[PDB]
Chains A and B, each alone.
Chain A
Amino acid sequence: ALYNFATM
Chain B
Amino acid sequence: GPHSLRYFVTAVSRPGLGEPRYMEVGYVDDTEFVRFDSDAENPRYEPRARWMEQEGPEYWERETQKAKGNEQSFRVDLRTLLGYYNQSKGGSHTIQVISGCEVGSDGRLLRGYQQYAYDGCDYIALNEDLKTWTAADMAALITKHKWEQAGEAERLRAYLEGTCVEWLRRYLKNGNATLLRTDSPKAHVTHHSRPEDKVTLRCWALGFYPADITLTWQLNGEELIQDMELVETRPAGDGTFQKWASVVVPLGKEQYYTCHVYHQGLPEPLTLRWEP
Interface positions of A (Cβ within 8 A of B): 1-8
Contacts and interface: CB of A to CB of B under 8 A. Distances in A.
B150 to A, nearest CB: 7
B101 to A, nearest CB: 10
A1 B146 CA distance: 25
Contacts of A7: 73, 76-77, 80, 146
B65 to A, nearest CB: 10
Interface in B69-101: 69-70, 73-74, 76-77, 80-81, 95, 97, 99
B159 A3 contact: yes
Contact of B7 (A2, A6, A8): A2
B218 to A, nearest CB: 43
Main secondary structure of the interface of B (DSSP, over half): helix
B247 interface: no
Contacts of A1: 5, 7, 26, 34, 63, 163-164, 167-168, 171
B9 to A, nearest CB: 8
Contacts of B24: 2
B143 interface: yes
Contacts of B73: 5-7
Given A2-B63, A5-B97, 13 more contacts: A1-B34, A2-B9, A2-B70, A3-B99, A3-B114, A3-B156, A3-B163, A3-B164, A5-B74, A6-B155, A7-B73, A8-B80, A8-B124
User: Which 9 pairs, one residue from A and one from B, show the smallest C-beta to C-beta distance?
Assistant: A1-B167, A8-B77, A8-B143, A2-B7, A5-B73, A6-B152, A3-B159, A5-B70, A7-B76
A2 B66 contact: yes
A2 B8 CA distance: 10
B51 interface: no
A1 to B, nearest CB: 4
Contacts of B99: 2-3, 5
A4 B80 contact: no
Contact of B26 (A2, A5, A6): A2
Contacts of B74: 5
17 contacts: A1-B168, A2-B70, A3-B159, A4-B66, A4-B69, A4-B70, A5-B70, A5-B99, A6-B73, A6-B152, A7-B73, A7-B146, A8-B80, A8-B81, A8-B116, A8-B124, A8-B146
